[PDB]
Amino acid sequence: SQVFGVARIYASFNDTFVHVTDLSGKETIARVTGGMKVKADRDESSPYAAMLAAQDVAAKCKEVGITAVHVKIRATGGTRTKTPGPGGQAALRALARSGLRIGRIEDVTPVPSDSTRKKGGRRGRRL
C-alpha cells in the first residue's frame, strides 16, 4: 500500500532544484525550482522559493500515487562547497509539511578525491 519515490534535492548558491523520481531514477515524476515560484533572480536561492517548489511537487506526488520518498540531498560539490545550503534544508522541511512520508535522508554531494583548479585564482573569490 506504500509506494516509494525518490526526492533528489540539489541546493545551489543561486537556485534550488526539487526533483522527484522513481526508485531507479530513470523516469522523472515532477520537477520544480525556485525560479518557477519567484519573480526576481535574487530570490531564486531564497528558502521561501524552496518551500514553494517543494509544496508544488508534493501535491503532484500525491496525484501520481507516490506516498513516500527517499531524500538524497546534494550541493554543487566538485570544486565548490560540499554541504547543502539553506534552500536545501527548507525544501526538506516543506516535504515533511506536505505530508509525504520521508524514508531515508542522505547527502550525495560530489566529493572529488582530486579537483581541477577552481575559477577563483590565487587571490580568491566571493569578495
Binding site: 528558502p47 565548490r80 562547497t81 560540499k82 554541504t83 545550503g85 539553506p86 534544508q89 527548507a90 577552481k118 577563483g120 590565487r122 587571490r123 580568491g124 573569490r125 566571493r126
Partner: peptide, 15 residues
C-alpha cells in the same frame, strides 16, 4: 522555525 545552518570552507575561499 526559520533558523538555518550555512557551512563552507576556507579552501572554498582561498587555497
Amino acid at each position: 522555525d526559520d533558523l538555518y545552518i550555512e557551512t563552507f570552507e576556507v579552501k572554498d575561499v582561498k587555497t
